Structure 1
């Protein structure tokens, strides 16, 4: 019976308005898009950690004798129609994509 070191959760989001852009800034995500000559809504598949606790580690199954650990949300980058001044831009926004375990060795 298989499973991963950090438990994650994934959801589709379609009510997105605010996002952080590729170099750290906040931007506004528009509701709809016009690609080719069709109108589409903007969707996003996000994965967060369940237990990001940075003291009672959410990492399962570690050599805790030699190793410290926690669960962390990593990010990918997708393009989205945002708002630049006030005509739109196609820009890369950062989104939660996964939950990985991070280590450091003990003194």
Structure 2
């Protein structure tokens, strides 16, 4: 996979996540825990983002300079989370979360 890759990134374990955006676009609260009838489990996330928009002054690494215009951007994906709205009723919802670092191309 893109170890060195065209764009550099970082992966980390997020443990504080308390709110987030829905697949519907809503801003919801993310619970700190999960379960019942057994010991409780913590709700955390494995996320990965870009280090910086341009590993090379031009843009992403390994590009055509003249023929292109680039930039590294962090992409999100959907993951299910135990969430709440208003804090009232709790349930599972798809929330957006950083998951990779992609190289976006342009022309001119």
TM-score, normalised to structure 1, is 0.86
**1:12 corresponds to:** 13
Q: Give yes or no for contact 1:57–1:71 (8 Å, CA) kept in 2.
A: no
**1:40 corresponds to:** 41
Over the aligned positions, Cα root-mean-square deviation in angstroms equals 1.8
Residues in 2 aligned to 1:30 and 1:3: alpha-carbon distance in whole angstroms? 35
- Sort the Cα spacing of 1:32 and 1:64 in 2 relative to 1 into closer, same or farther, 3 A: same
| Stretches of 4+ aligned residues off by more than 3 angstroms | 35-38
Q: Give yes or no for contact 1:47–1:97 (8 Å, CA) kept in 2.
A: yes
TM-score, normalised to structure 2, is 0.85
Residues in 1 aligned to 2:24 and 2:75: alpha-carbon distance in whole angstroms? 15
Task: From the two aligned structures, give the one with the greater strand fraction.
Answer: 1
Aligned residue for 1:10, secondary structure, equals strand
Residues in 2 aligned to 1:73 and 1:35: alpha-carbon distance in whole angstroms? 35
Unaligned runs of 5+ in 1: none
Using the TM superposition, give the Cα deviation of residue 26 of structure 1 relative to its aligned residue in structure 2, in angstroms: 0.9
Aligned pair count reads 103
